[PDB]
Amino acid sequence: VLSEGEWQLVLHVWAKVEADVAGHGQDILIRLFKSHPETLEKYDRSKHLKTEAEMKASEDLKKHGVTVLTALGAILKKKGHHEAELKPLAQSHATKHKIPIKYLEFISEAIIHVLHSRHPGDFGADAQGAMNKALELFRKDIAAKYKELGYQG
Ligand code: HEM
């Protein structure tokens, strides 16, 4: 679905993310909450964080961003061959957290924004197109798994 060149652009910028997983995850979650505040409702503890500085100071949020980006990176590195990595994520996000696909679109937008903000020289139009294809594939495949579990979000 992605070409080998597209996967290489995805993994090239992902290596830059991995130089500071925690900082990238903080910026991505903070961007998600500021652009789409309704998403913050899904987090029992984090939803009580009232300012950007509190969000940046939160060890809980920082640890969570690392968990999120580690899971996403493990999926991306499979270059589409991600059933085993995607299934447990679909299970929890469909049946426990109840995260609609539109919220995965919102976080994909935040990922793109932060990648471009931090790595513009390694995240031009072709690299952005490749990352958008990879995240579109992630969202398509997770939506199919959602439906297999009975969730139409
Ligand atoms: C790139 C997309 C995402 C990835 C890779 C991801 C990954 C994860 C991982 C690995 C966990 C911990 C294990 C688990 O419960 O499955 C998790 C927990 C969670 N995620 Fe996601 N996540 C995604 C997007 C979202 C979005 C968009 C929301 C809400 C808008 C969300 C809210 C949840 C919540 C509420 C928890 C439980 C947090 C807790 O109580 O400790 N996630 N996520």
**Determination technique used:** X-ray
Which CA distances in Å does 133 have to 32, 59, 126? 20, 32, 11
Q: Record the resolution, in angstroms.
A: 1.4
Check the annotation: does 64 bind a ligand: yes
The rounded Cα 107 to chain-centroid distance in angstroms is: 5
Q: Which residue's CA is minimally distant from atom 9 of ligand 1? A: 68
For 92-118, b/e burial (b = at least 16 CB within 10 A) is ebbeeeebbbebbebbbbbbbebbbeb
Which of these, 91, 102, 111, lies nearest to 139 by C-alpha position? 102
C-alpha 43 – ligand 1 centre gap (Å): 9
Question: Does 1-153 carry CATH code 3.40.50.150?
Answer: no
Check the annotation: does 93 bind a ligand: yes
Q: Which residue's CA is minimally distant from atom 40 of ligand 1? A: 43
